[PDB]
Design a protein around this ligand. Sequence first.
Ligand SMILES: Nc1ncnc2c1ncn2[C@@H]1O[C@H](COP(=O)(O)OP(=O)(O)O)[C@@H](O)[C@H]1O
Ligand SMILES: Nc1ncnc2c1ncn2[C@@H]1O[C@H](COP(=O)(O)OP(=O)(O)O)[C@@H](O)[C@H]1O
Ligand SMILES: [Mg+2]
Ligand SMILES: [Mg+2]
Lengths: 375, 375, 364, 7
Amino acid sequence: DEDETTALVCDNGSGLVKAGFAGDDAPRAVFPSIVGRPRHQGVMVGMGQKDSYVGDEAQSKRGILTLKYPIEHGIITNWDDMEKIWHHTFYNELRVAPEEHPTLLTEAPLNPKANREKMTQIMFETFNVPAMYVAIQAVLSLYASGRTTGIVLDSGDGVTHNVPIYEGYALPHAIMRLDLAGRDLTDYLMKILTERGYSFVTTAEREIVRDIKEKLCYVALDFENEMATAASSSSLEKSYELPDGQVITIGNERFRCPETLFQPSFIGMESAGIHETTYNSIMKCDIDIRKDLYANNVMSGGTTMYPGIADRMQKEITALAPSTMKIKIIAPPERKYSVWIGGSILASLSTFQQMWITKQEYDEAGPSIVHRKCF
Amino acid sequence: DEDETTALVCDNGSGLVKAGFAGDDAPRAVFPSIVGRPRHQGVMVGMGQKDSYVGDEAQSKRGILTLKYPIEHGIITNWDDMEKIWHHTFYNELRVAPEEHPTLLTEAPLNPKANREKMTQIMFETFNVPAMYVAIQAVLSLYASGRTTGIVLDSGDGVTHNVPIYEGYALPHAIMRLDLAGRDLTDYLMKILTERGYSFVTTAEREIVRDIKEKLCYVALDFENEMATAASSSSLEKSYELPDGQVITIGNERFRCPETLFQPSFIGMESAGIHETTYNSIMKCDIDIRKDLYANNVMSGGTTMYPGIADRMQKEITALAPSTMKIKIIAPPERKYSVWIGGSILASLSTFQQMWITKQEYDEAGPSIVHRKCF
Amino acid sequence: KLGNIEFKPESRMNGLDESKIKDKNELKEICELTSIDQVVLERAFSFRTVEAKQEKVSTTLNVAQAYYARDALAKNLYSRLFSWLVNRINESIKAQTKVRKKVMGVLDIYGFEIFEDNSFEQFIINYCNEKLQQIFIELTLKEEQEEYIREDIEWTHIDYFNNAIICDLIENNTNGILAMLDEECLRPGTVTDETFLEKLNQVCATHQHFESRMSKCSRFLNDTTLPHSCFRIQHYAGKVLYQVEGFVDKNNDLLYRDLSQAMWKAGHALIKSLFPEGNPAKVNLKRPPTAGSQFKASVATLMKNLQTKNPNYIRCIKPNDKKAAHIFSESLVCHQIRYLGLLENVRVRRAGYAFRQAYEPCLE
Amino acid sequence: AXXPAWX
Ligand SMILES: Nc1ncnc2c1ncn2[C@@H]1O[C@H](COP(=O)(O)OP(=O)(O)O)[C@@H](O)[C@H]1O
Ligand SMILES: Nc1ncnc2c1ncn2[C@@H]1O[C@H](COP(=O)(O)OP(=O)(O)O)[C@@H](O)[C@H]1O
Ligand SMILES: [Mg+2]
Ligand SMILES: [Mg+2]
């Protein structure tokens, strides 16, 4: 097993569990944050066929399951299913006892504090961790950059952040939160695939559409001329073989899916877009911070592996920011993992080991200790 | 280090520390007399991020600090912060031990005597200087002129002086003090910049406005025709690029800022102005002194590097003084430093080395020794 | 020949900037030499891969990180060739058919390398001297005490200056000097050495023996014998003044997984045999231990190979540096008497005894 | 400059 007391870094954003140990390059366990459950009856007698499938096994059996994400927009909705996800995380995937390891959880800013508080209650009461710490996810995404100055966009499966930090000091009044992320892009892609002719409605078919979004989507630097480019010829069409047979061929849907991220009116969501929430987070900072946020604009979570989103990102923030400013969009190709990687850095720091919310301090101050020790 | 017992000449007027050694051209250390302090929380763990930034480092980090001047109108208000300023002065900037060097401090006339007395108590009790001497700042500004006859205007960041001296003898009944100086001009410029459209309210933005005042202001020899000159055309407008982006364009504010110095009603301060306090200091002297004060009207501190203030100064004192008098405004371009330079002259004089308030005389007579040895 | 590789910046792609080698002739000849594919090792300096679960995504190093990977590959290749060499000497004379055996050992270890411009190396040297005096003051002095008290004589000898305070100064996992250097190499941001000395002044300098100039509660503030970018440590022998220049540059042992993974295919049955970490069937995901982890773990291995044994000491003294057989310089030997801790040794051995035996061979 | 709303 693990012969030491190495800290656990568990990172469930809203749609993908990535967990592992501190002082480590990559997360050891990366699996979908789903719990599946059979929706019709078992007939082969003597089969096993447990009435819950968590993680990657659920995508192995998703044709006979109703898949259900226990965490939506960064908020944990099903608590017993999230306990299934954590139980599978420690005991099956990462294959370790939580009693021996301090654990580092992550969440978004501007979240309900009962998420953080009940997450601490489940970590100490159910899994009996010795220490525990919730961490703001974009902050950790700046720990992976090796920077102490920068504004961080990450955009996981349920939430996007823009946390600005200058010289180690965060600017929590200048913080942002938009609930437009990759599951919303998956749903919008599923809608416009219904526009082309392909009907995906099941949760398993939603997982297929999510795969189409990951394999086969880019961001379109200039959306109008890319739109007319797809309207002119079929040079942007691309085929995807569905599981078990039929192939599909998608055109302008390839780049209309993450244009919703730059233009949230497509999914009917009144917002300013990703590029304007970055600029508005920078303009909420003080005057002497802003060029150090322009040159350090870290873009480091999931749903940013769309090809060209750093080009669209710089191309649009440059149009908002004044001239003679140096707009550098940092898009480090190890992102989708850098919230975990910065979790690994922070949990492996030696200054940090008196910042763990420990037990006998949880037992002393109840579950509200998180609002005086964590942030 | 320093292989001798050279005297320290430390000169904090109210807004700029300029310190160095005696027998020296220029002050070795010139830095802002500010102490900065973080106003929101530290988030990057393992950073350093000390909870006090003194001097030039505070202007390097002023976007996340609340800057605070420990000395206001020539009076030290925060004593622990002034001890931060002195500690940084000797041990970080000038990088020397105060135990080895007699120190020459400066202050204004007509100051509270607890400023001078507590400054002596902090120099002997805290820094353990062997000798110490407070010095009237405009007197030293006449030591830099190489003159022993003249009336001295200096106008630092918090106080302006007009000390008249004839044949080596000061006229302390004819002395003056106005509390209108460059920080008041910075605040008034910040107000009329709010009149044009640019809102500066933070202490860091106050430091930006102070920079606009230094780079981009002159004094307007005839204020009414300059005022109508700016009202006629845009030939007096000038642009200033703010830190991190936006450019501004100032017009009549370029010369309405130091007209407050010649006309203190703009900042709502009942006074006679700079030009009339000089003439009133001369008329308080005896009849046989005045033409030697007219021809030796030294104008030698900070806030006098406004272009044309010697032209406005001579042009207005000539209108007050009788005809057939020779009005010579001495404006030696080494001013903003000549209080320090005359401190260097006075501390390097050989007649002066029995005028130091020494320890074992401080210990004998308490801290009130300054009111029998200094002046 | 690996040291001639020098790097230059390169802008694209925007974030982070690529380090690019300048002249490929030295790289081409060491790749011809070691028989490794040249673009594999060329990408092993500028790129490091992260590998979570069946993904192989490759990220970009800094130029300074490229010199750190260059130097880390060099000194790990050399140190590991040295260890393989000692192991190959070992497997000629090995205790075959291993049984319960007894060992007599000889430790050729240095003394206090106190140099006029000390560095990280003399810091580790003086540190394992601190652990070495701890394996004197633990083993020998405490077996004196359990012996003396156990044999019914009423002593508890007067006092000793314990070294647990100095070990607590350096090897502490939170308040140590090596631990704040491991921080310093894991810190985001500018990681220059003056920020390390500032960190030592901040929270390491509540200590009785850590003596710095610009520390928090600084008693040594007005002392011109302490310069800046330096710190004293009052050891048990005396005070040693350390320059911090190159300190954080020589902590760094960024031997990434792609350096060993590159050199695992590299030609020889030696360089392949040096690095089992470069096996793709051996997924070693941990970050590289820098030097406080490595040298401190090597000191802990030394202490594992000494606490099971009885120590008997040699204190070795040179008269002068000019290799003279007659000339006995007094000042250099007085230096070595002061820092080998000999007068304190004479004081401790004047506790009660100088000789002990059992009854029967003494009567015989 | 300033603000929003201000210049
Ligand atoms: N290569 C890719 N291109 C586009 N989107 C992706 C890609 N990889 C993952 N995503 C999307 O990113 C989201 C997961 O990102 P991540 O940050 O791992 O989520 P979490 O919030 O669970 O941490 C999923 O919605 C997934 O659809
Ligand atoms: N070039 C300049 N033009 C106009 N004002 C200046 C200039 N340089 C400095 N000042 C003003 O002079 C003041 C500092 O002058 P100084 O005499 O050094 O102050 P102190 O009283 O601290 O010695 C500051 O308020 C600054 O705004
Ligand atoms: Mg995420
Ligand atoms: Mg002055």
